[PDB]
Subunit: 596 residues, 3 copies
């Protein structure tokens, strides 16, 4: 009996009944201890003696044994104990080897990480993916991972090691073909990695989430090719209430916080500092196998960001046999700013970017039905390369309502570069244009419409302070066709502007172009006393349907017309009044109108 | 001693002190084991031998015994262990029998559901409510449930069974008269039920929440009368970050995700697919006992939905002695679409519905102070039955600002049906009207104002692309009174429209009606050389306060007036200019204005 | 052996191996029990006998011993057991004595509070801070607190005791110089305290959060000087999904729910009832040591509130050597109302308040780049003291877009009081002005511009119903300079108003002032048959650039001009038409325009 009690079966001979309740099960101590499980239950030598974790101990085989066994019982939760640092020091074997995997995750087996998990220097200058849910080196032949949750107050520490080569990949958690999986509460820190977490595989997966996690200093070298902290590659999945911070210069050029790459995905309530980019919202044709060729129901809401490049990047692209499409997107409630930096020292600053594909093509995209509403954007006055939207690829629709944009440009694309075909671009009058860049805009157009064509578009410009440095409020080059569109410039703060709207190809004359903007016009009257016509000197107003005075009349003896219409020769004409006769000659500020 | 150790009191004789700390309590093993409790502690036969759960074992009495005992100690948390499926196979007894209850919940007794709970076929074709917090068959005589939380990674599975009769009710969790209760993390799946979760009873309760839950395939038959996944029937309560999915055809006609039925309630950050409806926002007079007759502070925000009927349904109604009122509502940040379906194949598609009461009455409602802002809505081009608002019952106010609506109608009600009395309907110019249904609108009015009367309303129509198929942008039948209102149609994309605004009863002439819209007008001048009047042929403009040209003047020898006013006979008149004399006759596009 | 087994080392001699797995560690029962720890492990007398908690037992020394020991092992989580009330009855010692501290928190030592913690009457009429993370009486010489989380379903109860003197301070949790600390799930209730929770110290700290907590009845006496439930005094920190309720009259005058006092902080998704105020958003120069002199990236979103004073209060101030600045703020998606109360019975009601510093100074502030969008506000019709913004101190910018404000005033400041210098105030036309206070506004200006000066501002007034009781829609006193601004009053619902816009100093004549508003004007014509001038009687229109008719013409024999311009003497002039000659005399409603 003494022998049995001191044996490993001893707890199995000591009886227990809950709180001495005579209606409760007559159990043994071992039964109650078996209700939980920790790493300590597997972290032992071949004789069963516990092994203490530390920098000179590789915990990997023990944690895999724990996961393997619990999986064999239908699942449960393994605790990684608090107050210890558990090091990993070798690669895993089998199906995760193809993924440079360390630990293989299994279905229904959760990890409650309370302590620290820390990579040993075996991993310096090597690729690695710490937790992998694929069960095959080829993801197309992998089984699924289901019902796998990682959570707790603990930490995954990537050891600070730099990438050995740019072509290497590194990851924290790759759930794989993942269904009902999640990461909650965990701090990922101190590395040079490609991603911290990836959800799904090429549309396969569902109901995967990252919640209340922290991501700190996960890019550190010039070798790192590219970084996105969370890649969402399955539908009905998202990121909420997370914290992302980088301190490295390289992060300001390469790093993005989130990628939303399948339908019904979201990014909410998070804070970002030190990153190049906020979120990619993309349908890659090459990723369309699991959930279709459309990314729709995409939501970026209520985030706080300090970035160096672009906040939201929209895109879609094609392969030889698949075409990707992006539609039904909402971007709302975000507060974003470009951090302090020299002009042109990072990727062009933007709130929205319509980005060309990975080969630079601008003619592959199918992006439409996007709503950008209720956001703030700010860039410091020196940052020339800052825009509400950089529209660099073909666009089939994007709607802006009730935003506050305070940056160098409202709409921009570089001349000479891409020539996007633009449809259904809507810039409502409720967008407020800030004044930070007033006086900085010599030679520049606030809306610089450097496109192949614009159709079914609305641009309602409203200033809220003067900026007499800008060349124009909106400019269309002669190469940009314009049709079935509405372009207006409100008069407030424009009285002293040389140019307000500029149509280099006289595109405002098109049959279905609706415009209005201020202009200075010289007029001369006939000499008749009484009601008397006034006519413009210049003859470039054949497109004008009506015009009206924006100027006071300093004269007593006459008044020019309050309103005007045109004539076939392109003059403006209206009826004023000569109290006394005489030829009159005046220069008036007019609101020019066409079909509005 | 050997006997005592092997007895159920054995753990009570084995000493323990935490980590060998000499300052810690000298306890016994049983004391430490007593700090937790699981189903295994009650899942035993009359001799105390543990019983293994399975399809042929009814776990119900054991789980009730666990809850009853823990309740007797002031509460705690019972674990339902992972790696096992616990079946329920009989009805509960006592106060929950009136509710077809299975398990009775008790105050301060939480359930950590890590495994699976699964209904046995005893329940096929029968009513049931799995967890019930009432303690009496009559809810009015029930005590309260307080401080009861259900949480974990586990599952409640309803066994797939169909309803036996439409009059039956089925539920997952009915908290009852519930205060500080919640469901977090749980998957509810595989059933034909009326609700998954209900919070509160007729306004009694507070601080009840459903967070991070999943609801999958909970309608499956033509017998199911009606389904709402979560019914919120107490104040200061809500639903956040949940996932709702249905696959059944019947769900597209009957199922709603949430009901917000008391004040200070919310529905946020959730994803919905396959449902008829998103949320009811309602004050039923019949439910007003616990928290008053007003539903106020109602919040529907930041959700993602694919539905087949209506996204938000507003209503209030009366009983013989109580009148319900709905006010102070916000609907914001939602991205919603009607899924692919034939026209008229499901309940009329809508973003907002003002719905008649359960007996079809449209004259009982008191709905006001509602803000609908910053939302997107889309319906495919074939879905005739799609509207930004179906306004089908009396409305005392609703405000639309900065939404993007892309569907067949903006405002609709069916003619010949209800004749709502409308007050304080505000449709701000910042609402963007999409183009998906361009060319589909033969015979139809984009704003079809099929009401008894409209007062204190604003409709500012702005198109963003052409749709020459529509009969009009806005139409008032002669039966609809219109007063103290503002109705405008912006000219952009309207030059080729036959009709823009239509007032079948000439209602735009009312003393306090403020309007503007485009119209084509034929004019003829006098023959005088010089300043010369032009007059409309037609005499239906006695209501016009001013008009101005929307057309160019192709003539050299004359120009028509830029602006016009009227005369008592209903002609328009203005002063143009004949360079050379002659009677002139022109057809001009004008902006007609009344008091604006 | 019997002796060893019954000794406190007995569990250390009973062997265990997990689930009889021969690959698992050969452990002892004590090893597995040592994986968790509770208060019971320290709640014992000097002989090691457990002590039962209760009203006559002071648990403080035992809980401190638990925290101290766990800290010595690198941390972990202590459970405060369910089903017991643990009383605290004495002050702590050492570094927390300076803070009237009870329990000292330590790094990596979490508290899972499942039971109740309750203050004994030793604390009646005394100061106290229940949990303190400082380790020194002087916060400047304190070390940090890191990785400390308090969570669970339990309760902190402040015993109901009133403050003994107004100068006393009371707190629930002061994390101190706190990094990665949080409170989740806890109910704080039944007290008279200054704060429930404070995060950070004068900018020192990071990543501190309060989530899913309840705060109930935490002010109860006239002695309580001031209350803010959560004070956020470190960056990258915030409050989400919490519930705040007060019932005391004194709370309606003194209590605020949240203070956001450092950069990158947030307040989201919460419900508030019974409070004076919703949130302070402030940069105090005196708090700028840890994170700089700027509060930026401040977010108040998606909250529900019933308050008695002001929802959001903006401010910044200076010390002898530091100047505080507030910028980049977003207030969005909130639904707020002033509760039922007499006019002037609580602090002036407001959605936004621009508040003077604690000494009443209005000339110290630097507040700019604020966006207020997509909110609802309501105040009952009797509450004279209700405003969308009380602008009481110097303002460098604030933007309003697409809100719904339903209260007495839109913009207000009291005359004779402060004279703020105002820049970059933007009130977009998409703001909807409700009608609740129609007929209540005798003697009052809806926008009462009681400022020293206004520059670079926009006010676009749009009514949605009539209120002929108001003196004016917008009024500038002669003492208020106005320049480089845009002020418009839409005509809808204004035909019967005596005054629309009022410029007591004729400020609308300034060179860069852009205005438009309705006015009644008397005109007289010359007697000439045919085209004939009409001139205003009055000569106060030298500022007018154009005007147009808002009235119909009831005459057959003539028509007045549709449009007008001015003359140097300040008359208006335009060209009408006399079919028959005669001097005409008419009174017309005109839209007066200046540079628009
Ligand atoms: C870091 C990042 O995510 N960057 C975005 C771009 O992603 C693209 O480049 C990445 C570079 O790291 C990835 O490619 C790399 O990894 C591939 C996947 O690894 C293989 O498969 C894994 C399952 C195994 O575990 C690995 O062992 C390995 O076998 C690899 O095939 C590539 O060769 C390599 O360079 C990224 O790849 C995706 O990764 C996710 C996450 O792991 C995975 O779920 C997907 O299966 C995988 N996709 C593909 C197609 O392989 C790859 O997509 C991203 O393209 C870009 C988007 O913006 C651009 O394109 C837009 C749309 O046209 C346009 O609007 C915009 O302007 C463009 O800039 O954004 C980041 O740069
Ligand atoms: C499924 C659903 O919720 N549908 C909404 C309508 O709800 C109404 O019908 C339901 C049909 O299932 C419920 O009625 C049924 O259940 C009743 C309650 O069961 C009793 O009481 C429970 C406490 C016991 O546990 C049970 O054992 C039983 O005794 C029953 O009395 C009815 O006879 C039965 O048909 C639903 O009832 C409510 O249920 C909640 C949740 O359990 C409960 O808290 C309430 O006490 C109970 N209320 C009442 C009054 O009994 C009942 O409300 C809903 O009416 C509709 C709203 O839209 C319509 O009305 C709007 C306002 O006028 C109008 O704008 C809109 O256009 C209309 O369509 O929405 C769903 O259909
Ligand atoms: C209750 C509250 O928070 N009210 C807001 C005002 O806060 C200011 O008054 C408070 C009154 O309770 C605090 O001052 C009191 O407490 C001080 C701190 O206690 C000391 O330090 C602690 C660390 C120790 O633990 C204590 O033992 C003690 O030694 C004390 O020095 C003061 O003497 C005392 O009256 C509040 O103080 C802050 O408290 C936080 C939280 O604990 C702490 O982190 C900070 O270090 C501490 N700050 C300072 C400067 O001491 C003090 O700030 C608040 O000022 C007001 C803001 O609105 C006004 O000002 C705006 C900007 O100009 C203006 O826009 C607006 O119109 C104004 O009304 O809001 C609440 O009233
Ligand atoms: Na690979
Ligand atoms: Na859109
Ligand atoms: Na072109
Ligand atoms: Na019943
Ligand atoms: Na409203
Ligand atoms: Na009628
Ligand atoms: Na102190
Ligand atoms: Na702003
Ligand atoms: Na002044």
């Amino acid at each position: 009996f003494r022998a049995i009690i001191e044996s490993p079966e001893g707890a199995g001979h000591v009886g227990y009944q809950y709180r001495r309740n005579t209606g409760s099960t007559m159990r043994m101590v071992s039964d109650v201890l078996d209700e939980r499980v920790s790493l300590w239950d597997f972290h032992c030598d071949p004789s069963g003696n516990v092994i203490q974790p530390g920098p000179n101990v590789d915990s990997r085989q023990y944690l895999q044994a724990a996961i393997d066994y619990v999986s064999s019982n239908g699942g449960g939760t393994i605790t990684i104990p608090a107050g210890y640092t558990w090091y990993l020091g070798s690669y895993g074997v089998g199906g995760i080897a193809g993924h440079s995997g360390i630990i293989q995750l299994r279905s229904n087996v959760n990890l409650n990480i309370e302590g620290r998990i820390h990579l040993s220097p075996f991993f310096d200058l090597k690729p690695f993916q710490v937790f992998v849910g694929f069960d095959n080196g080829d993801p197309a032949s992998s089984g699924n991972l289901e019902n796998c949750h990682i959570y707790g107050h603990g930490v995954v520490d990537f050891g600070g090691y730099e990438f050995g080569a740019s072509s290497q990949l590194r990851n924290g958690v790759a759930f794989g073909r993942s269904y009902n999986c999640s990461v909650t509460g965990i701090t990922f820190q101190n590395g040079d990695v490609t991603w911290a977490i990836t959800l799904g595989w090429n549309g396969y997966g569902s109901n995967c989430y990252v919640r209340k996690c922290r991501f700190i200093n996960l890019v550190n070298s010039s070798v790192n090719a590219n970084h996105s902290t969370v890649y969402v590659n399955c539908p009905y999945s998202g990121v909420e209430s997370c914290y992302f911070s980088m301190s490295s210069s390289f992060a300001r050029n390469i790093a993005c916080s989130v990628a939303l790459h399948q339908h019904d995905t979201f990014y909410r309530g998070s804070t970002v500092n030190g990153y190049c980019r906020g979120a990619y919202v993309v349908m890659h044709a090459a990723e369309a196998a699991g959930a279709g060729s459309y990314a729709y129901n995409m939501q970026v809401e209520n985030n706080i960001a300090v970035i160096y490049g672009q906040f939201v990047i929209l895109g879609s692209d094609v392969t030889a046999t698949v075409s990707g499409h992006l539609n039904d997107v909402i971007v709302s409630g975000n507060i974003v700013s470009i951090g302090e930096r020299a002009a042109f020292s990072a990727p062009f600053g933007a709130f929205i970017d319509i980005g060309p594909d990975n080969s630079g093509a601008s003619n592959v995209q199918d992006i439409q039905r996007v709503l950008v509403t209720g956001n703030s954007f700010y860039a410091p006055a020196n940052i020339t390369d800052s825009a509400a939207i950089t529209l660099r690829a073909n666009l089939n629709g994007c709607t802006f309502i009730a935003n506050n944009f305070d940056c160098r440009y409202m709409v921009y694309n570089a001349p000479g570069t891409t020539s996007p075909v633009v449809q259904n671009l809507v810039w409502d009058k409720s967008n407020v244009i800030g004044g930070t860049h007033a006086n900085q805009r010599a030679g520049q157009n606030l809306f610089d419409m450097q496109f192949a064509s614009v159709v079914n578009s609305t641009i309602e410009v409203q200033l809220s302070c003067e900026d007499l440095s800008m060349f124009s409020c909106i400019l269309f080059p002669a190469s940009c066709q314009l049709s079935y569109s509405k372009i207006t410039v409100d008069s407030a703060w424009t009285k002293s502007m040389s140019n307000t709207a500029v149509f280099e190809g006289n595109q405002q004359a098109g049959a279905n172009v609706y415009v209005s903007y201020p202009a200075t016009v010289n007029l001369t009257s006939y000499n008749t006393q009484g009601a008397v016509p006034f006519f413009s000197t210049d003859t470039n107003y054949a497109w004008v349907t009506s015009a009206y005075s924006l100027s006071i009349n300093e004269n007593l003896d006459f008044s020019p017309p309050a309103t005007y219409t045109n004539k076939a020769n392109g003059q403006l004409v209206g009826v004023g009044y000569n109290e006394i006769g005489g030829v009159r000659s005046v220069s008036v500020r007019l609101m020019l109108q066409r079909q509005v």
